[PDB]
Write a protein that binds this DNA or RNA. Structure first.
Lengths: 21, 50, 485, 754, 718
RNA sequence: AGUAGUAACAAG
């Protein structure tokens, strides 16, 4: 995308909670 | 002395001697080294030949 | 030896450590609140917020200054032809007649069919220009023998108080207009993504400043000093009429030549860099000088007519003033564009930091906001004693104006004040950081600041602003003294 | 709503916005008229800080001499010059312990450099006081006028080539019973004028010979010229500065070279290090002291300023420093290093133009020169001057100069004064108290780091440091110095806040058109932008705007607007024609009304090189004409070097890359003085130039490599042309007739030179 | 030419002033009179130029035929000064004259121009043939290093370069013949042919030759691209807050690729070592790392050299490991043995104590020096055998000294006279002067065998030869990055890789979304804490629900790699405890939660008694400023509750709306020591503030005085 | 007058 477009920043590490079901 | 030596050598297409020559013969087109020794001429000759 | 001497050296030789507190930081230059003192008068080379330019469409070309002034005056013929003006204000030592005659000579010369912009050295021009006012240099022997000849006591900068107009200037100059005056030349086309980044940034940064009132005032100063320095070298012996002009561009991209008035360049045999050339300025304004008379003691003001401006007849005054400049001031005026770089650098650095955090160019986000990030705001001023926030662009436009004011009001008083008050700024920061600052001679530090507060309109207002901001910083510190107790 | 520019600091830390606090778009302060008022101030203050010392009369000059060294210890916090030799020697001894062999290493290197140093080295100085004309001239001019004048008194040590035999002549000249020298005196011709006074005085300066006595000469050789510092930033009031003669420069060079060797190896010296090397060094020193902080303790940084630095420092202390530093040195070199401090110990200040008295009634003004300063009653001076001259009296000399034994008005010992400052930093502790101090020192600027258990104990260390400095003649400013917990400080206008922050405003005036020529200025302008992007945090948006601003300034300065512009001008008229006549207009330089194609990526490429392949071969042929008449005799300095003047610091030379062309011109020398005919001075200049050009005609290497030899220029030129001729004839480049003419001419030259 | 000069000298010697100057001025004193200037020196050049450009004739004209080709005026515009205005000043011209010359002047010869200005034209082709990658917005830790500003044709000392230029331009004036002429014969010859036939002033040629022979090194802020070809684009490569990928045109040296290769491999191992299955991650990263434009695997396979780190990555990528070492002018390849380095303060024979690295173990090496090929055998601080082949005096002189210097024999260290990496400095010392080191060795007998012979200091065969002179790989790699032979013998490990963090000469890129994990300490710190701030809502919520899975969140693994291997586990023990304590005793502090959370990743290491280690500051890799403060703010991490601003490495982020109202009045004393809480206010009866030692040697139930920071004393109970 | 500011310029 364009540098000013927020989607120019790469997808960062995201903490996804865990559950056995 | 060096300017003369390098002018002469460069003109007559001869290697510039690493040391400063005493004379240059224009007929022969060769640099000359003069030696005044208080011993044997042959001893001084071969010692400066090295 | 060191411990020997240190043992016998007096306890009176001490660095006198004092742990700094907010209470110790009293307001700087308390005399600026003293109503006995005169309010600091306007002393700039040209008008700024009070300027009025007579607009005339450019046919694309950049015609001769005399021609463009002539053509502009032809379109506002009523103001040009006024020979019966009403004297509104007179400067103590100003000759109103001589000034008005000099204005008429300027108008008549600029409007005549000759290419020359030279004025005859008339009795009124000679007076206005300071003809033959340099003292005669006699021989040292005669001077020694002459008892009446003394080394004069030096003039000292007068002590003034806060003037409401210096705030007004800051307020109005940092404001957006519909016109652009910048004359920024071309650069090579972009290849590197970082080159494309700069160009997309300039669309926000440069356009914000270009549209603001201060830019147009700056360009007027830049272009006038440019012509004045050339006139000063090329025509040393001649009195010359120089138009005060600007090329402004509207929203659609239409060019207009602005005529802010006419100036008289006196004789200019400028040998030394500090040598003064008298410039007599005749500048148009809508501002009635009686509304804030404390601003205008240096000025002789005529009412020359009226213009229909917004469904209303608005009065047009001619501000006349004997001024002066030297080569240095003109050369720095010619370089005043650099006000852009100092402001742009400071604010771009924040965008670059913000981009570092978010992972994409935060220019648009900071200015106008985007779908992810709210627009970046700054504490901009005060209204009814309460702290008011404004935009990134406004903050940029404030710094840029401030940097223009550094040129417009720049001198040893501002140099000394800025240098000495910077220590106090860094100490305040130390208290704000909770880095426990200690001082050795606080009252000596204040002396060095306060001796620089005299008659510089910017220093006096900066001192006022410093104290205002200090008050709000002291109030904030009360939130920190509770932490971890 | 009322805008307050200080409200920025609510949202941004002061260090993070420190550039906005530098008003470097404003005009820097200039002085008007005389500097005598300021010079007399220095003479008085310098003596006020030493007056409790020993006062005596010099049996060489008859001057009033004050010696504060080993004087009584001060009993107040006023500037003290009462430095204790013992404490200085103990400070230097503790440095010698921490740096074993440094003093002998420094002395050896400095001595070996001196033995290799030639006299021409003295031409690399700036403005120098010329005792022959009692005015400031360039270093190379003052050197020449000294060498040539020295020949009139049988002093030919300069001819040997090395600095030492020239310096031998300088000290030996002080023994000459009389000195004959080449001076300048002007012939007055009264002409008519169209002004109040009715007439004119046209002066014609001419070279003369003048004779002065030994005492008169010694006084001149010991004399400093004084003027007011112009365009100095961050100061309300002006100050006096001083320029030394050419004689002392050789000795100062060696003492500063000695001090540089020491400074280089001192961990806490900010000199001679500069720019990014300094920043790294300071940043490392801050990181060390942070990590080496006692756990539970506190680290504190003094943002240090010294007051009356030059006024209080004493030549006698530097004399001791040179003595203690050159301990294990040959007596000759110890004696060599001793001379610069000794000449400074007996220095005399010239008091400038004097004061101007006026009649406001009669509109008359007159200059009262320094010799005649007391020719009028002091009631006729203003209160400030009346007070000054009364305090000057005891130090005043008949010929309008002042004795100035104490102080260092000229400076020139920046490195050696730094070594003295680092000596104080080196003490670290007094009386085994529960604190440690260290820091950085750049001349009169210092940062002191103090480690201790509490800030109360830290303050004890700062107080001990304060007191220790007084013993070396160093006075910490309590007014301008402040302290805080380590993390932020200021050092030589560089601002630290968990790292050094950018200060863009400091560099702002350097962005302008340099004023070398339109070629050099283009390279300089683009390089300044390039370097400020790298070093001073200038972003791409600002960098690009800088390119525009620079081109705007350049086009207006050199009157070289775009060929398609409708701008009036004599140059513009021909630019407009060149625009029409040219097919490849992309190839035209901005100076030839061409387009600007500079962007961030190509800032480092010379404009001619960028545009070369886009140029018309007729334009390219003209622009780069090998024998064009605008480029004169180019020196290796001429092409690469340019003096760039920062807002803050001494005027430094920077390198630029530019192709030599018709824009690489030079402005006529400033031989444009009102009612002055310079015909004699210009002829002298042209004579030296003729001789040097013809020498370069014979020796083409001279421009590049310094020619060596103690033999005559003529002897060298003749021998060269004789060989040129012979080998031109014996090769068949020269005709038999030309050879005979050449060898005949050379025969006449051979006679003239013997 | 010659006759013209002689005739002009005669004309000049007519002037008695010139005659005096020429006779009295020595050749030395030419250099003084060349700069002679009586004109008043300009103090304001920038002002003087703006002034002078408004005057009629500000420029100086060179008198000649070409000056005369300029007319007096053009279409009314006066070009040069009138003939009646010249005299005792000279002929001046207007700026319009230059314009006129560039418009209608003589067209001169430009042949050789591009060959004279080759240096500048290459600089342009490097940009013109360049490729630009992405620009990215993130933290850039720049280091100030001494770097080369511009690429060179062949780098020389100035004195050497000077002689070479003299031989090219002014041979007759070159003076005493120098040995450099023979060394640079192929350069001189080449330059003579290029600079043959050009009419440009020799001084310009000289300068432009000096530009491509004499180096310009300066201190500049760099970030992983140090080669001149990058340095000349440094302004576009990065700021503090952004990176621009740039591949310059032209060819790059193999030595540049080799140096970057090593930096890359060392970085991959440093990040891999901290992973569960380092070998897996090492392979994942190594495959996706690029040195400029060349893949890492390609460089390793192509270049016959490197270090431990390179071989480890080679073994991981399935390449044959080289055991090549380059000791300046000596090239060794391991035959047998294994050596480990132990830095100890050995006393050296000059009179100083330098920290030199002792290589333990018995090793055999395949030494090489042009003609010389030999097999070495060195033990701990000794040389035992050295079998070398017959070669030239010059080739043998190097190898024999190099072998005895690299072996680090105790005789070499106790034979230093005068003021001198420390080991490479000894190489360049004993190479220049060798007659000092041989005297501090000793001589022995020569073998009279069929192939064996001996040589002495005279570079020839003698019976007094130096002591010890004798003149005539299918590896596996473990999960933990150890190289094991079939016999179980480990010949290389991760712990054998250099700790030295240096700048790559070529720009290294990682074609992976994990590229941020390859950052430096300050880069990783900044990003890690940004990841925490980006996921703070879910991270904090899940932690308050009782779950502690966030402790071992992948995002924190890279962070661990810049925590010293010793303390990582101990820091985690403290961190996890302090965190759990905050939620378990309802004394939460979000700033402290954020600060310590990343330290919780490592497998916890508790004290012998089962309680966690207490800490004042958490020290990270790099300089003294690289630490976190538990109680205080640090250069890396600081929080201001006044404005709710969190400063991480200078970057300011707002915690506004991520703070509990009751949290602002909560003292940090509850989240400062593991198994401690705020009892009350400071109690003078309890004495001074307790150290970490005294706090660790406290029996549960006892109270103590703690100082959070200057002016915040608190009474804490266990 | 004015510029300016511890001392000048307002031609020589």
């Amino acid at each position: 995308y364009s540098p000013t477009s927020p989607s120019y920043s790469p997808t960062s590490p995201s903490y996804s909670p865990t559950s056995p079901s | 002395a060096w300017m003369v030596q390098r002018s002469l050598a460069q003109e007559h297409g001869i290697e510039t001697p690493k040391y400063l020559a005493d004379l240059f013969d224009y007929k022969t087109k060769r640099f000359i080294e003069v030696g005044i020794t208080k011993g044997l001429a042959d001893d001084y000759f071969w010692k400066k030949k090295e | 030896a060191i411990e020997r001497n240190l043992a016998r050296m007096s306890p009176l030789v001490s660095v006198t450590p004092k742990k700094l507190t907010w209470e110790d930081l009293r307001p700087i230059g308390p005399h600026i609140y003293n109503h006995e003192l005169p309010e600091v008068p306007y002393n700039a080379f040209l008008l700024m917020s009070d300027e009025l330019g007579l607009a005339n469409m450019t046919e694309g070309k950049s015609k001769k200054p005399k021609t463009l002034a002539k053509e502009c005056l032809e379109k506002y013929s009523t103001l040009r032809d006024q020979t019966d003006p009403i004297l509104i204000m007179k400067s103590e030592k100003a000759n109103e007649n001589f000034l008005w005659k000099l204005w008429r000579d300027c108008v008549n010369t600029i409007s005549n069919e000759e290419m020359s912009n030279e004025l005859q050295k008339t009795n009124y021009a000679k007076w206005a220009t300071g003809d033959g006012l340099t003292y005669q240099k006699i021989m040292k022997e005669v001077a020694i023998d002459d008892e009446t000849m003394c080394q004069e006591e030096p003039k000292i900068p007068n002590k003034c108080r806060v003037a409401a107009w210096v705030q007004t200037e800051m307020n109005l100059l940092s404001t957006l207009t519909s016109k652009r005056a910048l004359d920024l030349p071309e650069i090579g086309p972009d290849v590197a993504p970082v080159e494309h980044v700069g160009s997309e940034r300039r669309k926000y940064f440069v356009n914000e400043i270009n549209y603001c009132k201060a830019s147009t005032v700056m360009m007027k100063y830049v272009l006038f000093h440019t012509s004045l320095l050339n006139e000063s070298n090329a025509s040393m012996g001649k009195y010359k009429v120089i138009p005060i002009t600007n090329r402004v561009v509207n929203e659609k991209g239409e060019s207009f030549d602005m005529l802010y008035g006419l100036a008289v360049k006196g004789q200019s045999h400028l040998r030394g860099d500090t040598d003064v050339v008298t410039v007599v300025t005749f500048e148009f304004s809508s501002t009635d000088p009686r509304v804030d008379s404390g601003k205008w003691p240096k000025y002789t003001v005529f009412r020359i007519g009226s213009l229909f401006v917004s469904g209303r007849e608005k009065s047009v005054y001619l501000y006349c003033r004997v001024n002066g400049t030297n080569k240095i001031q003109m050369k720095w005026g010619m370089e005043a564009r650099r006000c852009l770089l100092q402001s742009m650098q400071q604010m771009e650095a924040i965008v670059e930091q913000e981009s570092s955090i978010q992972g994409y160019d935060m220019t648009k986000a900071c200015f106008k906001g985007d779908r992810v990030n709210s627009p970046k705001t700054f504490s901009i001023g005060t209204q009814e004693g309460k702290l008011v926030k404004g935009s990134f662009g406004k903050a940029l436009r404030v710094i840029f104006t401030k940097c223009l004011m550094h040129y417009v009001f720049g001198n040893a008083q501002l140099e000394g004040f800025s240098a000495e008050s910077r220590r106090l700024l860094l100490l305040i920061q130390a208290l704000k950081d909770r880095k426990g600052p200690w001082v050795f001679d606080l009252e000596g530090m204040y002396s060095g600041i306060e001796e620089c507060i005299s008659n510089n309109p910017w220093v006096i207002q900066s001192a006022y602003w410093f104290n205002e901001w200090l008050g709000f910083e002291k109030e904030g510190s009360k939130v920190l003294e509770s932490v971890d107790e | 709503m009322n805008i307050n520019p200080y409200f920025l600091f609510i949202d941004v830390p002061i260090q993070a916005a420190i550039s906005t606090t530098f008003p470097y778009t404003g005009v820097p302060p200039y002085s008007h008229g005389t500097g005598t008022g300021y010079t007399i101030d220095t003479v008085i203050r310098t003596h006020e800080y030493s007056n409790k010392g020993k006062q005596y009369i010099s049996d060489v000059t008859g001057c009033t001499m004050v010696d504060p060294t080993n004087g009584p210890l001060p009993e107040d916090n006023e500037p003290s010059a009462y430095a204790q030799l013992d404490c200085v020697l103990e400070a230097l001894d503790r440095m010698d312990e921490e740096h074993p062999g440094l003093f002998q290493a420094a002395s050896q290197n400095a001595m070996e450099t001196l033995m290799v140093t030639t006299v021409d080295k003295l031409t690399q100085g700036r403005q120098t006081f010329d005792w022959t004309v009692c005015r400031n001239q360039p270093a190379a001019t003052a050197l020449n006028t000294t060498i040539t004048s020295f020949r009139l008194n049988d002093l030919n040590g300069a001819d040997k080539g090395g600095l030492i035999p020239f310096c031998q002549d300088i000290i030996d000249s002080l023994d000459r019973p009389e000195m004959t020298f080449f001076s300048v005196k002007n012939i007055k011709k009264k002409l008519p004028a169209k002004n109040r006074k009715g007439f004119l005085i046209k002066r014609i300066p001419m070279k003369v010979k003048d004779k002065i006595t030994k005492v008169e000469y010694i006084k001149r050789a010991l004399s400093l010229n004084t003027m007011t510092k112009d365009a100095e930033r961050g100061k309300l009031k002006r100050r006096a500065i001083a320029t030394a003669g050419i004689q002392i420069r050789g000795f100062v060079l060696v003492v500063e070279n000695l001090a540089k060797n020491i400074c280089e190896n001192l961990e806490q010296s900010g000199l001679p290090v500069g720019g990014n090397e300094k920043k790294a060094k300071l940043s490392n020193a801050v990181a060390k002291m942070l990590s080496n902080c006692p756990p539970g303790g506190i680290s504190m940084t003094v943002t240090g300023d010294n007051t009356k630095w030059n006024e209080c420092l004493n030549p006698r202390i530097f004399l001791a420093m040179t003595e203690r530093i050159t301990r294990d040195s040959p007596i000759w070199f110890r004696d060599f290093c001793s001379i610069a401090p000794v000449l400074f110990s007996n220095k005399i200040a010239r008091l400038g133009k004097g004061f101007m008295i006026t009649s406001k009634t009669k509109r008359l003004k007159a200059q009262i020169p320094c010799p005649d300063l007391f020719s009028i009653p002091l009631e006729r001076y203003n209160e400030e001057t009346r007070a000054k001259l009364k305090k000057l009296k005891p130090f005043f000399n008949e010929e309008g100069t002042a004795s100035l034994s104490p102080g260092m008005m000229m400076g020139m010992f920046n490195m050696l004064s730094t070594v003295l400052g680092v000596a104080a930093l080196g003490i670290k502790n007094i009386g085994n108290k529960e604190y440690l101090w260290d820091g950085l020192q750049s001349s009169d600027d210092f940062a002191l780091f103090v480690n201790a258990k509490d800030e109360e104990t830290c303050m004890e260390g700062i107080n001990d440091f304060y007191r220790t400095c007084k013993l070396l003649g160093i006075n910490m400013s309590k007014k301008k110095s402040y302290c805080n917990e380590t993390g932020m400080f200021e050092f030589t206008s560089m601002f630290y806040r968990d790292g050094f922050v950018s200060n863009f405003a400091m560099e702002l005036p350097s962005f302008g058109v340099a004023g070398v020529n339109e070629s050099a200025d283009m390279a300089i302008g683009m390089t300044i932008i390039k370097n400020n992007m790298i070093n001073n945090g200038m972003g791409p948006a600002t960098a690009q705007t800088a390119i525009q601003l620079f081109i705007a300034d350049y086009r207006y300065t050199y009157k070289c607007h775009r060929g398609d512009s409708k701008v009036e001008g004599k140059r513009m008229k021909i630019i407009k024609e060149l625009w029409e006549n040219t097919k490849g207009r992309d190839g035209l330089l901005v100076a030839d009304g061409g387009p600007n194609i500079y962007n961030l990526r190509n800032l480092h490429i010379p404009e001619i090189v960028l545009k070369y392949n886009l140029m018309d071969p007729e334009y390219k042929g003209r622009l780069l004409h090998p024998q064009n008449p605008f480029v004169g005799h180019l020196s290796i300095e001429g092409i690469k070097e340019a003096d760039i003047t920062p807002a803050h610091g001494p005027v430094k030379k920077m390198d630029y890359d530019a192709v030599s062309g018709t824009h690489s011109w030079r402005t006529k020398r400033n031989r444009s003085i009102l009612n002055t005919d310079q015909r004699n001075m210009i002829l002298e200049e042209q004579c030296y130039a003729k001789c040097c050009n013809l020498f370069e005609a014979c020796f083409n290497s001279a421009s590049y490599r310094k020619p060596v030899g103690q033999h005559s220029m003529l002897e060298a030129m003749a021998h060269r042309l004789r060989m040129d001729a012979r080998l031109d004839y014996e090769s068949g480049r020269m005709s038999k007739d030309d050879f005979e003419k050449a060898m005949a001419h050379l025969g006449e030259i051979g006679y003239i030179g013997s | 030419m010659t006759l013209a000069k002689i005739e002009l000298l005669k004309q000049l010697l007519r002037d008695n002033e010139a005659k005096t100057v020429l006779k009295q001025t020595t050749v030395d004193q030419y250099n003084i009179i060349r700069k002679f200037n009586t004109s008043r020196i300009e103090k304001n050049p920038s002002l003087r130029m703006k002034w002078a450009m408004c005057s009629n004739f500000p420029l100086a004209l060179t008198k000649g035929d070409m000056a005369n080709r300029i007319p007096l005026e053009y279409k009314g515009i006066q070009l040069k000064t009138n003939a009646e205005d010249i005299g005792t000043k000279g002929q001046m011209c207007s700026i319009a004259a230059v314009t006129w010359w560039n418009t209608y002047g003589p067209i001169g010869d430009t042949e050789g121009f591009e060959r004279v200005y080759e240096s500048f034209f290459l600089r342009k082709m490097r940009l013109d043939n360049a490729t630009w990658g992405r620009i990215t917005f993130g933290p850039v830790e720049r280091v100030r290093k001494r770097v080369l500003l511009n690429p060179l044709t062949k780098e020389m000392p100035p004195d050497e370069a000077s002689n070479v230029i003299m031989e090219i331009l002014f041979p007759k004036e070159a003076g005493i013949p120098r040995e450099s002429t023979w060394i640079h014969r192929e350069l001189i010859k080449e330059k003579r042919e290029k600079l043959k036939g050009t009419m440009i002033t020799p001084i310009v040629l000289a300068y432009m030759l000096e530009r491509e022979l004499v180096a310009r090194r300066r201190f500049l802020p760099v970030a992983g691209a140090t080669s001149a070809e990058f340095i000349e684009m440094l302004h576009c490569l990065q700021g503090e807050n952004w990176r621009q990928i740039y591949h310059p045109g032209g060819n790059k040296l193999t030595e540049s690729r080799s140096q970057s290769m090593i930096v890359a491999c060392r970085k991959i191992i440093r990040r891999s070592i901290v992973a569960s299955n380092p070998l897996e991650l090492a392979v994942e990263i190594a495959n996706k790392t690029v040195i400029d434009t060349e893949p890492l695997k390609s460089c390793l396979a192509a270049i016959d050299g490197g270090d431990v780190a390179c071989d480890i990555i080679r073994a991981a990528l399935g390449l044959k490991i080289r055991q090549r070492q380059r000791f300046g002018r000596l090239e060794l390849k391991r035959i047998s043995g294994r050596g480990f380095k132990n830095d100890e303060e050995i006393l050296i024979g000059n009179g100083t104590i330098q920290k030199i690295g002792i290589w333990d173990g018995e090793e055999e090496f395949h030494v090489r020096c042009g003609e010389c090929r030999g097999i070495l055998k060195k033990s701990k601080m000794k040389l035992e055998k050295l079998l070398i082949n017959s070669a030239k005096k010059e080739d043998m002189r190097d190898l024999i000294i190099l072998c005895m210097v690299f072996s680090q024999d105790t005789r070499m260290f106790q034979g230093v006279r005068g003021e001198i990496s420390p080991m490479y400095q000894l190489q360049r010392y004993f190479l220049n002067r060798s007659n000092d080191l041989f005297d501090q060795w000793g001589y022995e007998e020569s073998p009279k065998a069929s192939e064996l012979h001996g040589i002495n200091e005279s570079m020839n065969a003698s019976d007094y030869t130096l002591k010890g002179v004798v003149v005539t790989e299918k590896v596996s790699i473990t999960k933990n990055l150890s190289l094991i032979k079939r016999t179980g013998e480990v010949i290389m490990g991760a712990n054998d890789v250099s700790e030295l963090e240096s700048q790559a000469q070529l720009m290294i890129t990682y074609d992976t979304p994990k590229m941020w994990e390859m950052g430096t300490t300050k880069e990783l710190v900044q990003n890690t804490y940004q990841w925490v701030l980006k996921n703070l809502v879910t991270l904090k919520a899940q932690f308050l629900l009782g779950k502690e899975d966030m402790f071992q969140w992948d995002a924190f693994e890279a962070f661990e790699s810049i925590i010293p291997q010793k303390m990582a586990g101990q820091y985690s023990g403290f961190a996890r405890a302090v965190l759990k304590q905050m939620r378990d005793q309802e004394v939460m502090k979000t700033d402290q939660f954020i600060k310590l959370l990343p330290f919780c990743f490592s497998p916890p290491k508790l004290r012998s008694n089962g309680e966690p280690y207490q800490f004042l500051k958490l020290v990270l890799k790099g300089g003294g400023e690289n630490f976190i403060e538990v109680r205080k703010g640090s250069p890396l991490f600081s929080y201001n509750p006044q404005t709710e601003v969190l400063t991480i490495c200078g970057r300011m982020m707002s915690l506004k709306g991520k703070i509990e109202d009751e949290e602002r009045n909560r003292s940090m004393g509850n989240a400062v020591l593991a198994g401690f809480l705020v009892s009350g206010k400071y109690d003078p009866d309890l004495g001074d503030f307790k150290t970490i030692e005294e706090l660790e040697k406290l029996k549960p139930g006892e109270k103590a005085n703690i100082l959070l920071y200057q002016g915040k004393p608190v009474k804490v109970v266990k």
